[PDB]
Amino acid sequence: AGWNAYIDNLMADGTCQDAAIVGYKDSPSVWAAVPGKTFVNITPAEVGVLVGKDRSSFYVNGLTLGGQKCSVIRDSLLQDGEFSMDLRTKSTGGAPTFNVTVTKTDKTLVLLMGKEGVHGGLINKKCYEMASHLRRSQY
């Protein structure tokens, strides 16, 4: 069972519209993602934005995930106890805005893109359970 089974486990309940296991250690690339969606086009430059030491640049105009502009709300990502990253998708002209959660494991990046009207807390707890499950398995 590969990482596509892990994406299907992330696509089990149907609350989230996109999932991403993206490498930042060993093999820095998108290891798996939902095909056709935003997070399959995550560059390692966007990973270096995410894993970078500057925790104050991305507050000026958001950052980019898969070419999509998004706004940071919370930053507890490099902190070892929490390892969490809360974003919301920016939009132009009254287009609907979506909740985004990014987390570190030991080797991977777990990114989740939610649906319309779906609260970011459920996205956050599901991604935290996923990151804790990966960190329990030394991943």
């Binding site: 919370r74 929490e82 609260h119 970011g120």
Partner: protein
Amino acid sequence: TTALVCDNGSGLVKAGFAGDDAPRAVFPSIVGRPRHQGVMVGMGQKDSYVGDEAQSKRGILTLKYPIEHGIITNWDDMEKIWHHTFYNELRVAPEEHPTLLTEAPLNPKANREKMTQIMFETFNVPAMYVAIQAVLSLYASGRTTGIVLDSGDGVTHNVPIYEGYALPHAIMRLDLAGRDLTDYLMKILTERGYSFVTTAEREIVRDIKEKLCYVALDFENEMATAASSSSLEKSYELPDGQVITIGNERFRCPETLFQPSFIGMESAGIHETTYNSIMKCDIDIRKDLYANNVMSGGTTMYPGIADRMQKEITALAPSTMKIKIIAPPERKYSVWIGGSILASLSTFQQMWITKQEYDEAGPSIVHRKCF
């Protein structure tokens, strides 16, 4: 079932039911213990008094004001205040009413986690949501996105809100509120020639701050007519007969909000922290921040604070001639009234934190449901 809304204030804790126009209980944030030693029976006198009962018998009680500058420090006295707030002030048990709660902005995370675990373990509420006072303050005006100035009794804050969700990076703090204004008012009335060493004198100066003090449209012009104004000089009668005359100090006590250099610190004012907090956001939200600027707290009851906020935001920001700063008449309790508006709706039933969520997620659910 009707919901309960309480504003856990630094100087006045308010409590009541959802949907009510006014809070049913308004009591000061005090816990009294008996000041002298003596035991007897005396038909079962209580060991601790809270609130209006603590206010009424306060001569034989040493009081505690346990919130320091918005932030909770002593936790047992908050637990006793919350026990009074449920069990005797509203006369309820908290295990069936969902309870909306208020936090000071830039609250430490351990305070939020401790608050959530004391709600879920001790009181055992079936539903609780922590909201920033500014988000409820925007909800009393009836909108979901904008920056809000909130000055209570503890601390002044400017908080930006996006679709009901606050942005903790651009929240700014000004270290003054109505307690600091009260201390400054005793300072400049002492400089005028008076003296306030007792409890009742401090309460009289609090009521002077409640009744007489105002904000002028222009500080420099009203200084320029201060000796010549026939309507500026007010006074107050203490019930034992002392007369306190107040002049220009009526608009020097709240102008500490606008300029904190009046008292001797270099912090930015309620218009300058608002402007600097607007610029620290994303660029797109800033017009909606200016469009829905709400002041809140009892520290905004000074008449003519609306047009002075208008003139100061007009001075700093050249795009804001015509946008109006919204000042509801009931923004004493706009945290509580917005909590009533938020909790009474049928769209809020998902956003409550269940007991099982705390059991499976720990206290850190307050980081992730309350945002």
